[PDB]
Amino acid sequence: MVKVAILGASGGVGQPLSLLLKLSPYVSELALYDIRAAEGIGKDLSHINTNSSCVGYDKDSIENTLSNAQVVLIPAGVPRKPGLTRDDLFKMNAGIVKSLVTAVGKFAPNARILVISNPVNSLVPIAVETLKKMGKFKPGNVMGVTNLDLVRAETFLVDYLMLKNPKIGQEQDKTTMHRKVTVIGGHSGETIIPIITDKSLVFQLDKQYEHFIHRVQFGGDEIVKAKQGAGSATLSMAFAGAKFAEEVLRSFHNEKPETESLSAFVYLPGLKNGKKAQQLVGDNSIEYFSLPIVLRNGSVVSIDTSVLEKLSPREEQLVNTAVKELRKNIEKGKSFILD
Amino acid sequence: MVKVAILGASGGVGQPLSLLLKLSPYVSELALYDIRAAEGIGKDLSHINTNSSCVGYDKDSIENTLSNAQVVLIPAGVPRKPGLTRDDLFKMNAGIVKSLVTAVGKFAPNARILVISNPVNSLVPIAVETLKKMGKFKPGNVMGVTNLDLVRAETFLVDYLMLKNPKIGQEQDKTTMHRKVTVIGGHSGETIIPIITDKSLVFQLDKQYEHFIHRVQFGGDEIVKAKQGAGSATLSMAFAGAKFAEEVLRSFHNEKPETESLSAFVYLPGLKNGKKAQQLVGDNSIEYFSLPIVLRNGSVVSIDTSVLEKLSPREEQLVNTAVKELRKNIEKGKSFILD
Ligand SMILES: NC(=O)c1ccc[n+]([C@@H]2O[C@H](COP(=O)([O-])OP(=O)(O)OC[C@H]3O[C@@H](n4cnc5c(N)ncnc54)[C@H](O)[C@@H]3O)[C@@H](O)[C@H]2O)c1
Ligand SMILES: Nc1ncnc2c1ncn2[C@@H]1O[C@H](COP(=O)(O)OP(=O)(O)O)[C@@H](O)[C@H]1O
Ligand SMILES: [Cl-]
Ligand SMILES: [Cl-]
């Protein structure tokens, strides 16, 4: 009995995201919004025989969309095309995020905002600074959705074990690999830090360990390449988004998350153990990081810093490389709002 | 565990259908095929952390797609769109289904073939007559997926009870309404026959009963209008197709179906109780109809005619209207192949 709003519901990620949300038993009302086509998508989903009402809204009805929404998912954004650089992509997506998050601050300021659009590293700071200007920022209620990195880590860990030690590989369940790997950091390239917490599995991977790390880090490129440079992960991104959203929704329902060490990109200074986590990643002013979180009533109430205590030596070096680049991605987002 | 192939995986229905199949615990390998883009969607999907291996294939690689496939879903087709007549759609889909079913006959002749392409009423006969010419027709292995009509009936029964009297409406779970409604007949307009098997819900509907029947029959039209002409159901059809497939997959693993009186459009003369079904619908030569099926090892082994035994008077009229129209649709399909 959570009301969920999806902003950007007609897009490549948004459609399958809206479908997976419609299937959740934790949702009572699903409201879909987009500048185009959301009413028809809503109507199509409304035929599905699960116990949630689903309505889509036209471009002028964002207030009806958001009214009393407890959770707001934002996969809105512009897709890559000829003549649009990564910096154009950034600037248009930053304008979209600014505008959507402003609307949340106006029409549903108590909502948990789950930012799915990319680049997360910069767009989450944009969301936070947009809300601070408005006096509507609650640190536990803004989460960058980084879960696709964990999902990839769980899948590739098993793929590399199959390839390397078939007997150990055959023993693994891709759906429970979160017990053995945790992914922290940012959401792009070398900001992504996969931490295998079971050292026997690091042993079993042998010389595939670095290939594994590279593959989780550059997973998105593998799809962009598989799609001839024309698109990126849509379906797996919608999957990872809905899986994270479900963990958030379970917390309204007094249920423990199914994912061990579930991570999200969050505002460290405003959250319990955030200071400790800044100390552990070796940068005392770094404002954002994806780390394990504890949810209560849909809100992040503290950061679990366990994983950072027990880091291997090589993991320490990944963390340092990530932090360097993440500081600049954070500042690029901050300066979009602060100028 | 089960190998599944999807032919037409890149489309409107195909993509989210492929996503939902990727999530199934009954699937060991998922192979995706289309005239464009299947490699890239398969690769996207392959990052999802569920145990199936998922690979997409280029337009020249249907043999590799089909090789040792147990279940083949065919959401391939041309959907409704302005400027296309009913007859244009039939002819374009007929050729697509003939060609794909030929390829099943050649490369995976033991597969269960689930036709999602519309119009089901005519395209399933085309699939059957195509297989018959090749000597590769097994009656229990060719099913028209009509399941969206049951999905709509379960949804709309709850929505209409919720207006007529909230007290009974609220006691309903959409997800288990198949205990109270079964849909039979064909898959278009007035071929569609919703049978409320609980008489006390019929009572509670009062003069919404005819509105309910009509909404189930014309659900397709409702989405086309909500999408302003731009196709019909995509996401709800992917949901319905995945649900049906799952009942098929479940039967390989010796497990009871979760859907009471699950229906599909099947070839009556090749199946146990099909002669009895023909007599009950009042046409001793009708070759196809959508009725509750019993599955064993992914194949229909009998038809359950219970629902036809105690039809209301008014249900009797729906059945008679549907059979008239069905006979024509079936004969249109058969003539496509038989010239
Ligand atoms: N069973 C139902 O209740 C139901 C409901 C809705 C839609 N449909 C039907 O599903 C079909 C697909 O609809 P859509 O909205 O996905 O259309 P779409 O145009 O979005 O997708 C169709 C896909 O089929 C592909 N295709 C065409 N010919 C092919 C071939 N020979 N081999 C492989 N792929 C081929 C196209 O490349 C495309 O990717 C249509 O027939 C539509 O009428 C059925
Ligand atoms: N200000 C906005 N508010 C809501 N939706 C938006 C806004 N700007 C763009 N969108 C939508 O976001 C969606 C993005 O989807 P798409 O361009 O297919 O790429 P992807 O989901 O892969 O990023 C589109 O449906 C687009 O209309
Ligand atoms: Cl609010
Ligand atoms: Cl075979």
Question: What report would you give on this structure?
Answer:
- The structure is a homodimer of 339-residue chains.
- The first copy, chain A, is an alpha/beta fold and 339 residues long.
- Chain A contains 14 helices and eleven strands.
- Chain A folds into two domains: 1-145, NAD(P)-binding Rossmann-like Domain (Rossmann fold), CATH 3.40.50; 146-339, L-2-Hydroxyisocaproate Dehydrogenase, Chain A, domain 2 (Alpha-Beta Complex).
- In chain A, the strands form three sheets. In chain A, strands 3-2-1-4-5-6 form a six-stranded parallel β-sheet, with helices on both faces. Chain A has a three-stranded antiparallel β-sheet with strand order 9-10-11. In chain A, strands 7-8 form a two-stranded antiparallel ribbon.
- In chain A, helix 6 packs antiparallel against helix 9 (209-217).
- The longest helix of chain A is centred in the C-terminal third of the chain and has 26 residues, at 313-338.
- The A-B interface holds A 15-16, 18-19, 22-23, 37, 39-51, 148, 151-152, 154-155, 158, 173-175, 177, 219, 222-223, 226-228, 231, 233-236, 238-239 and B 15-16, 18-19, 22-23, 37, 39-41, 43-51, 148, 151-152, 154-155, 158, 173-175, 177, 219, 222-223, 226-228, 230, 233-236, 238-239.
Keywords:
homodimer, 339 residues, Rossmann fold, L-2-Hydroxyisocaproate Dehydrogenase, Chain A, domain 2, 6-stranded parallel sheet, 14 helices, binds nicotinamide-adenine-dinucleotide, binds adenosine-5'-diphosphate, binds chloride ion
